Amino acid sequence: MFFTQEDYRKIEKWLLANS
Amino acid sequence: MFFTQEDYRKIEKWLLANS
Amino acid sequence: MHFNELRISQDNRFLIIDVSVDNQDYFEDVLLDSIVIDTQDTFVMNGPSDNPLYIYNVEDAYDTQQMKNVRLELNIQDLKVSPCSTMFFVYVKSKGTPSTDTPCGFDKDQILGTVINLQPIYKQTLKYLKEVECDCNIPKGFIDMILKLKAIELCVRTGNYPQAIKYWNKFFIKNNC
Amino acid sequence: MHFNELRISQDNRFLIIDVSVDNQDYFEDVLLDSIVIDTQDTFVMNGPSDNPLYIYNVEDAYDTQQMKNVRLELNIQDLKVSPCSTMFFVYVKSKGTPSTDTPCGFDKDQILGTVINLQPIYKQTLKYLKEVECDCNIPKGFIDMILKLKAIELCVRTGNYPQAIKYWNKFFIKNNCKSPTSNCGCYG
Amino acid sequence: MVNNINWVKLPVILDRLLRHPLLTDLNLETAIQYTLDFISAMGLPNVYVDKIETIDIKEYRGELPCDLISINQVRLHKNGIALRAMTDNFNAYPTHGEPSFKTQGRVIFTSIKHEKVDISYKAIMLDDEGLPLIPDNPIFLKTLELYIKKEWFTILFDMGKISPAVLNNTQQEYAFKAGQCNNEFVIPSVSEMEAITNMWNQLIPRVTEFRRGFKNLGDKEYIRVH
Amino acid sequence: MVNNINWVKLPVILDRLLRHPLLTDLNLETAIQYTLDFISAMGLPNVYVDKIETIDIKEYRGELPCDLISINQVRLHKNGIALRAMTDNFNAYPTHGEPSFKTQGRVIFTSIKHEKVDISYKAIMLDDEGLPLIPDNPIFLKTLELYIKKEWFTILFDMGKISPAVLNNTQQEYAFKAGQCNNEFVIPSVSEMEAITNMWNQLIPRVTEFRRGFKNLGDKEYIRVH
Amino acid sequence: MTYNELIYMVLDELKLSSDDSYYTPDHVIFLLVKYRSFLLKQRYSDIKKQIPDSDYQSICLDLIEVPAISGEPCEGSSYLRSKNKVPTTMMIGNPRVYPMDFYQGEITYISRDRMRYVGYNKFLRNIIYCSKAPDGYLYFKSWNPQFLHLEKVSFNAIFEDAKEASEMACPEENGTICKLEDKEFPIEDALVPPLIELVVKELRGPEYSPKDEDNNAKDDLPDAR
Amino acid sequence: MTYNELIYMVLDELKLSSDDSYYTPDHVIFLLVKYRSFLLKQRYSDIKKQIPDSDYQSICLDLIEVPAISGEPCEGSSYLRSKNKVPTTMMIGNPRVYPMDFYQGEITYISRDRMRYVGYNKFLRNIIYCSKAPDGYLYFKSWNPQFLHLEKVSFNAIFEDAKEASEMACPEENGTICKLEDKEFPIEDALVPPLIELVVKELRGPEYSPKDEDNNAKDDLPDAR
Amino acid sequence: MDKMLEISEEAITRYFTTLSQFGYKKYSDVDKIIVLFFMEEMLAGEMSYYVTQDDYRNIVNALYCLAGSTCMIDFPMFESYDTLVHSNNRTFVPRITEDSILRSTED
Amino acid sequence: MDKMLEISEEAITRYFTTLSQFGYKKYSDVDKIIVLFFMEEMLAGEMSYYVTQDDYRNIVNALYCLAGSTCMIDFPMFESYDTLVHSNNRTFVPRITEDSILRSTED
């Protein structure tokens, strides 16, 4: 499995959306 | 990637293991 | 899951997707989630890319067995892509959890289906046959086209989609239909 | 009566069989009798051999649409045969009588379906794949692999099963693959 | 050339060589190599197939056909103007005229960036098998026979399995037939002498048939009467 | 050269040499050395790869490319003006004109302190392995075959394992094919004769194509009509 | 003529008729087979002459695909080779491997050293090359993947040992000949008297020589016993 | 043919059948192996001729990295060498070390004196060179550090002593042949009668010569005892 | 068709029989085989719905260039009872020596 | 990835197996190996956070130039069930011989 920058951006944005 | 909803649940779950 | 039919309509106006979930007794909890369409320009290895051609969510259409079967007829001209020279990649995902008695390897949540328009290949074969009718000599370009198609088929069946994109763009991109 | 899904799993574990009777309205009284799995080494011209690899009587179950549709997921390790160097012959025997007025040739009590693992063959073909790119040379290896596979295909679809084994033994009996890991893996 | 190049398959030469009991270990595999060597050593342009094939120039470079051996001309597709040999030593190299070309391998180096060029080239006539196809001229056939016999006898002489007199005779005969074969394929026919004559007598000399594809080289030069 | 330099790998020559039972101890290792010797002894400029590569001059000195064998030209990068051979005996030595150069090893001695110079040089075409790559011209191939055979037979004659007549024949054949191979690679093609013709006929002679990269050497000389 | 006729010509000229003879027919077969190659080399190695059809033999081979070294991916392309070891040919005649039809096919028998380097010529990429490796087997090489389907070939040459090549002949129309004695000896009739007199001269002297004929824990030959 | 067939041809022509014979088969093996090299030199040293495949043998070597002199830093780059001492090749054939595939690889067998100086040519920096040092071992040299990974090679040449090279053959498909007598003797059939008659002439005279046969603290040979 | 299958199977079996006997077959004929079974799979698959009768005519007339081209491919035989000149088995049966106003008559 | 690891390990094991059998391998292929495991360590390390999806596309398409380039590197195989022309298993089930105002109907 490999993550790109955009994947991390999605993950962090979605973490912050629900906190 | 195209993250599913359950994957976001998985990521938050694994982050709160270290709660 | 699996594909019932996956083709471009014979009138070169619709891209037909018909998906179903497999009928085994241990996939009752597995449904369908979404359909994401990608082209040879936006395709990436790890799943559907960002900024896809067309995202579809199945909950919106229906108001539970209905969500185990989905059919679409996407007007290609609405997608703003050429039906002649485009390689659609159709991903499907499952919003479900199979039973614990699932045999190893069958719990694959995502699938992929590659689509091309077969009309330009048919016309090209007809041209080459018409040339064969004269002096009963097989053009080398005809054997080249056949073997290049077989190369792309092997690339698709073995999962090596990027080299299939290179072959498609380099060899079959200029198509008339 | 026809085959719905006939394959070997790409993880080299399961010989998947999914046979179901035709849905026409003359095929009610016809049921499934048994499923006999046979290999290239124990093949006979007519019907299954008297020493098959695996037998499965359908009637030893719930006793009607459950009979008309059957699915097997045999583990190949249990059969003690190589998933890749083996060619399976799946015979399906019917139990019943189709009601009259059916066109002749449709009332075939028995069908045969051949199974092979195409993954090693694709491995072998990918070696010569790149010859297609280069011009001024015939892609001789690519053409040879294509013809080798197409030979088994046509000899199967024509019913010429013996020459199908001769070609299989000549070409693909020495196929190698990663044997399935008995301890299952974590993934999803 | 007076006679016509009627093609026949390569083992026609093995029909004739194997008449000699000392050449019975010769093969199609050996005949192919020595036939190609003979074809090159004679350098006759009537033995090759004339072909024309267009290619694209990406940037001062173009891909060359597979069967090319020698180029008659290169010209621009849109104008038809022929190209000359490139004498420039820094052709597409910038710092901080008429078109020309240069070919080494599978690549043709032109002085133009992006144009289609037409190449008139010579290839080898092949068989239904991918093999050379030889003229059936009995002079050509006898000379190729004598070439192969001379090479085989030279090896056998290096061993000491042939007399020096036998090799000397073979070399003499091959030399005479080589000269005769050279004159057979090169001396013009009657139509080629009419073309040469129309090239030779010009009251007003024509000195620009390279620009065209030498189309008007043998055209007669008419002077109006006054 | 009339024909094109289609490249083939070195063991093509060992295919042909080993036909001779007396040459069966030959190797790729021996073929490499004798092939390089033949390449140099013939000195054919069509066998080398033309390259252009810029370098910096630190102070009357510059580092030279690795694969360089011979220099066609050196010129200044910014002006494009070519350099000549340096005749000066104290070039960068002070006490208490036009630019020129001099090259000995990996170092080029120019008369300029700090400038970029463009060098158009010739190298050897290499293989996927770092090995020489030979033309497939059967004249070139036959001549290289005869060269290696001549050297091997000369050693064996120094031992006394070959007859003097056999060596004399080998030397005669190699000499003739060497002359023929020299003429094959050097005689101009049709395009090269158009360039030579446009160099030859000038009503107003052009005598300054060294300043340019000989770009206009084969350009036709047009006179306006009055 | 057969092995039997030559063997018994030699035995009868030596008059080795009794079963209690020191020199058996096995000695005769050995000497005949070696002197055949001796004579064939003396006749047809000085300068090149016509070799008659009598000196030749067709051995009959089954080919199998084998790796170049082992089953590794980078060990090079595979070869075909004969299942059984092949006799060494003498270098005097017209060696030829053919595909069960002498008048058809182009399979080239070349040297071991040459076959290291063959097929690079673009017009010679479809020729099958043969040579006997030092392993003792006949190896096949080609740049055309079709050659790996080849199953059977016949090899006709002046083999260096007639016995080995006679054991591996193709089946005749009637069938195989089990006894070597009933097979045909591979030599021209013009070279049979020279071969016979050489073998008879070889065994004439030893025929009448003394033996260590007493059993006394002693060497009895210096006494002409 | 095998060592056994040649040995017993010689013994039977000499009629050395009894176990109480002065000249044993060991004398025969020694004389055969020496006369083989004698004949091979007489035939193939005057002027260059074709050597048949029968004269050749493949010995089979395991290589080990060794220091040039000792383990010192400045003692030069290391070599590979065969674990066991290698036979001396005769200088008449086509010596060749190959990497278990005769039709592949480029490992050069050269002289000791040449190998002092090899590889300086920039295009010859990747060629592996071989030579038998006076130590008796086969040494390998190259400017390419990859050559030090080489583990196994086969060496095919006309070795000067057939017994030494027969003890070191590669395993056959069936397996190793323990008895030298069951192995193949390395000589062409055309040179077998010359070899046999030379050995038989060598031992014919001594076969019938007298012995010092009395045990009397005396030399009994002048009396023809 | 059911016959393109037979022709293709026969063609490739002859191909591999030739590669078994010999170790070579002309690639100019391998090209004909490639065209042949490519057409067979084309017409027996999902792309047979694009074929008109004009296309069928052209495809058949292009395939019969391959018929006697090589030894692998033969001229197919179909079950036929016709010929260029037919036999006339009609019988003459006049009525009591009668004729019409211009010509003869029968039953 | 978990697969660049496998490709690199297979590539170098083939490299050293070749250096064991022979004593040489083309440095034009050692270059491909160097690029391959340099990319593998680049993407499996601290520098994988600089990679966009465009960069991922470019990296993958540049790595597949190495795929069949040499014998050490092979074309990877992924678990795929697709093809260029798919099979249509839909079934036709009309309702009591009915049709709509223009066309047929099913369940």
mmCIF file of N, CA and C in Angstrom, chain C residues 24 26 103-109 143-144 147-148 150-152 154-155 157-158 160 163 167 170-171, chain D residues 7 9 11 13-14 16 71 73 119 122 125-126 129-130 132-133 135 139 142-143 146 184-185 187-188:
data_model
loop_
_atom_site.group_PDB
_atom_site.id
_atom_site.type_symbol
_atom_site.label_atom_id
_atom_site.label_comp_id
_atom_site.label_asym_id
_atom_site.label_seq_id
_atom_site.Cartn_x
_atom_site.Cartn_y
_atom_site.Cartn_z
ATOM 1 N N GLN C 24 -23.603 -16.060 -3.224
ATOM 2 C CA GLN C 24 -23.314 -17.058 -2.204
ATOM 3 C C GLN C 24 -23.998 -16.713 -0.886
ATOM 4 N N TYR C 26 -22.937 -16.477 1.993
ATOM 5 C CA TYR C 26 -22.126 -15.709 2.929
ATOM 6 C C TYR C 26 -21.875 -14.277 2.472
ATOM 7 N N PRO C 103 -14.552 -18.221 2.410
ATOM 8 C CA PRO C 103 -13.268 -18.839 2.071
ATOM 9 C C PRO C 103 -12.207 -17.784 1.805
ATOM 10 N N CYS C 104 -10.954 -18.152 2.062
ATOM 11 C CA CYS C 104 -9.848 -17.219 1.891
ATOM 12 C C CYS C 104 -9.768 -16.727 0.452
ATOM 13 N N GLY C 105 -9.676 -15.409 0.290
ATOM 14 C CA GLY C 105 -9.473 -14.782 -0.997
ATOM 15 C C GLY C 105 -10.726 -14.229 -1.636
ATOM 16 N N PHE C 106 -11.907 -14.660 -1.196
ATOM 17 C CA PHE C 106 -13.149 -14.208 -1.807
ATOM 18 C C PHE C 106 -13.660 -12.896 -1.229
ATOM 19 N N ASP C 107 -13.048 -12.389 -0.158
ATOM 20 C CA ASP C 107 -13.493 -11.149 0.479
ATOM 21 C C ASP C 107 -12.762 -9.940 -0.116
ATOM 22 N N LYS C 108 -13.015 -9.699 -1.402
ATOM 23 C CA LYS C 108 -12.400 -8.600 -2.144
ATOM 24 C C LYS C 108 -13.460 -7.524 -2.356
ATOM 25 N N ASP C 109 -13.271 -6.370 -1.713
ATOM 26 C CA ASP C 109 -14.328 -5.363 -1.662
ATOM 27 C C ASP C 109 -14.453 -4.589 -2.970
ATOM 28 N N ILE C 143 -1.431 -7.970 -39.188
ATOM 29 C CA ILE C 143 -0.866 -8.838 -38.159
ATOM 30 C C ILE C 143 -0.369 -8.007 -36.988
ATOM 31 N N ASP C 144 0.218 -6.844 -37.274
ATOM 32 C CA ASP C 144 0.655 -5.962 -36.199
ATOM 33 C C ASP C 144 -0.517 -5.542 -35.327
ATOM 34 N N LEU C 147 -1.689 -8.558 -33.149
ATOM 35 C CA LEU C 147 -0.803 -8.893 -32.041
ATOM 36 C C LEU C 147 -0.735 -7.777 -31.011
ATOM 37 N N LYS C 148 -0.892 -6.522 -31.426
ATOM 38 C CA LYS C 148 -0.931 -5.435 -30.457
ATOM 39 C C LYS C 148 -2.193 -5.519 -29.609
ATOM 40 N N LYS C 150 -3.659 -8.334 -28.875
ATOM 41 C CA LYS C 150 -3.407 -9.434 -27.950
ATOM 42 C C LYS C 150 -2.492 -8.998 -26.811
ATOM 43 N N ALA C 151 -1.525 -8.126 -27.103
ATOM 44 C CA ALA C 151 -0.675 -7.590 -26.046
ATOM 45 C C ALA C 151 -1.490 -6.793 -25.038
ATOM 46 N N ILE C 152 -2.407 -5.952 -25.519
ATOM 47 C CA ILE C 152 -3.223 -5.163 -24.597
ATOM 48 C C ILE C 152 -4.139 -6.070 -23.788
ATOM 49 N N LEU C 154 -3.466 -9.146 -22.846
ATOM 50 C CA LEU C 154 -2.638 -9.754 -21.809
ATOM 51 C C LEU C 154 -2.330 -8.758 -20.702
ATOM 52 N N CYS C 155 -2.074 -7.502 -21.061
ATOM 53 C CA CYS C 155 -1.799 -6.493 -20.045
ATOM 54 C C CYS C 155 -3.011 -6.278 -19.146
ATOM 55 N N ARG C 157 -5.490 -8.569 -18.558
ATOM 56 C CA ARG C 157 -5.794 -9.771 -17.783
ATOM 57 C C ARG C 157 -4.790 -10.013 -16.667
ATOM 58 N N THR C 158 -3.560 -9.533 -16.817
ATOM 59 C CA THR C 158 -2.544 -9.657 -15.781
ATOM 60 C C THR C 158 -2.509 -8.467 -14.833
ATOM 61 N N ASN C 160 -1.722 -5.282 -15.466
ATOM 62 C CA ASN C 160 -0.718 -4.263 -15.767
ATOM 63 C C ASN C 160 -1.361 -3.206 -16.657
ATOM 64 N N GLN C 163 0.928 -0.200 -18.724
ATOM 65 C CA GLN C 163 1.548 -0.516 -20.008
ATOM 66 C C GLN C 163 0.476 -0.717 -21.072
ATOM 67 N N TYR C 167 0.409 1.217 -24.653
ATOM 68 C CA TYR C 167 0.131 0.566 -25.932
ATOM 69 C C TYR C 167 -1.096 1.165 -26.607
ATOM 70 N N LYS C 170 -0.264 4.698 -27.886
ATOM 71 C CA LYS C 170 0.741 4.743 -28.938
ATOM 72 C C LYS C 170 0.229 4.116 -30.230
ATOM 73 N N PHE C 171 -0.617 3.090 -30.130
ATOM 74 C CA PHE C 171 -0.993 2.275 -31.279
ATOM 75 C C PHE C 171 -2.433 2.483 -31.736
ATOM 76 N N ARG D 7 -13.759 -22.112 -12.765
ATOM 77 C CA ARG D 7 -12.450 -21.486 -12.649
ATOM 78 C C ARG D 7 -11.660 -22.052 -11.481
ATOM 79 N N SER D 9 -9.223 -20.533 -8.482
ATOM 80 C CA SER D 9 -8.993 -19.246 -7.841
ATOM 81 C C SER D 9 -7.556 -18.800 -8.061
ATOM 82 N N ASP D 11 -5.519 -17.388 -6.247
ATOM 83 C CA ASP D 11 -4.628 -17.726 -5.143
ATOM 84 C C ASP D 11 -4.218 -19.194 -5.143
ATOM 85 N N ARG D 13 -5.868 -21.918 -4.594
ATOM 86 C CA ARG D 13 -6.476 -22.726 -3.541
ATOM 87 C C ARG D 13 -7.658 -23.547 -4.027
ATOM 88 N N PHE D 14 -8.625 -22.911 -4.681
ATOM 89 C CA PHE D 14 -9.961 -23.462 -4.851
ATOM 90 C C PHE D 14 -10.253 -23.727 -6.318
ATOM 91 N N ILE D 16 -13.219 -23.823 -8.358
ATOM 92 C CA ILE D 16 -14.574 -23.312 -8.189
ATOM 93 C C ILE D 16 -15.460 -23.879 -9.287
ATOM 94 N N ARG D 71 -23.001 -25.597 -6.201
ATOM 95 C CA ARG D 71 -21.710 -24.923 -6.207
ATOM 96 C C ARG D 71 -20.728 -25.688 -5.335
ATOM 97 N N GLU D 73 -16.457 -25.675 -4.046
ATOM 98 C CA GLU D 73 -15.290 -24.826 -3.821
ATOM 99 C C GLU D 73 -14.126 -25.667 -3.312
ATOM 100 N N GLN D 119 -2.871 -18.429 -15.129
ATOM 101 C CA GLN D 119 -1.876 -17.527 -14.552
ATOM 102 C C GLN D 119 -0.443 -17.904 -14.898
ATOM 103 N N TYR D 122 0.083 -16.875 -18.483
ATOM 104 C CA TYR D 122 0.276 -15.435 -18.613
ATOM 105 C C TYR D 122 1.655 -15.009 -18.139
ATOM 106 N N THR D 125 3.837 -15.750 -21.008
ATOM 107 C CA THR D 125 3.618 -14.866 -22.152
ATOM 108 C C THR D 125 4.155 -13.459 -21.896
ATOM 109 N N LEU D 126 4.130 -13.007 -20.640
ATOM 110 C CA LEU D 126 4.649 -11.681 -20.333
ATOM 111 C C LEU D 126 6.135 -11.577 -20.638
ATOM 112 N N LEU D 129 6.085 -10.484 -24.121
ATOM 113 C CA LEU D 129 5.205 -9.348 -24.397
ATOM 114 C C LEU D 129 5.934 -8.211 -25.105
ATOM 115 N N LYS D 130 7.109 -7.831 -24.606
ATOM 116 C CA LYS D 130 7.772 -6.631 -25.100
ATOM 117 C C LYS D 130 8.266 -6.761 -26.533
ATOM 118 N N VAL D 132 6.454 -7.221 -28.957
ATOM 119 C CA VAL D 132 5.456 -6.562 -29.788
ATOM 120 C C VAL D 132 5.888 -5.135 -30.099
ATOM 121 N N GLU D 133 6.537 -4.472 -29.138
ATOM 122 C CA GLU D 133 6.953 -3.086 -29.338
ATOM 123 C C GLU D 133 7.958 -2.969 -30.473
ATOM 124 N N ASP D 135 9.908 -3.118 -33.749
ATOM 125 C CA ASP D 135 9.650 -3.361 -35.158
ATOM 126 C C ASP D 135 10.892 -3.961 -35.803
ATOM 127 N N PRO D 139 7.556 -10.951 -33.615
ATOM 128 C CA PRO D 139 7.479 -11.387 -32.217
ATOM 129 C C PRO D 139 7.227 -12.881 -32.143
ATOM 130 N N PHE D 142 6.034 -14.353 -28.622
ATOM 131 C CA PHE D 142 4.660 -13.948 -28.348
ATOM 132 C C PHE D 142 3.683 -14.742 -29.202
ATOM 133 N N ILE D 143 3.984 -14.867 -30.493
ATOM 134 C CA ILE D 143 3.130 -15.628 -31.396
ATOM 135 C C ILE D 143 3.073 -17.084 -30.963
ATOM 136 N N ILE D 146 0.845 -17.450 -27.902
ATOM 137 C CA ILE D 146 -0.549 -17.270 -28.282
ATOM 138 C C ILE D 146 -1.081 -18.527 -28.952
ATOM 139 N N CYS D 184 -3.826 -19.119 6.387
ATOM 140 C CA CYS D 184 -4.438 -18.037 5.634
ATOM 141 C C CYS D 184 -3.833 -16.695 6.037
ATOM 142 N N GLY D 185 -3.917 -15.737 5.118
ATOM 143 C CA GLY D 185 -3.320 -14.426 5.297
ATOM 144 C C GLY D 185 -4.359 -13.389 5.677
ATOM 145 N N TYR D 187 -5.951 -9.863 5.196
ATOM 146 C CA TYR D 187 -6.118 -8.865 4.148
ATOM 147 C C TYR D 187 -7.610 -8.680 3.908
ATOM 148 N N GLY D 188 -7.938 -7.668 3.112
ATOM 149 C CA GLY D 188 -9.322 -7.357 2.812
ATOM 150 C C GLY D 188 -9.470 -6.065 2.035
#
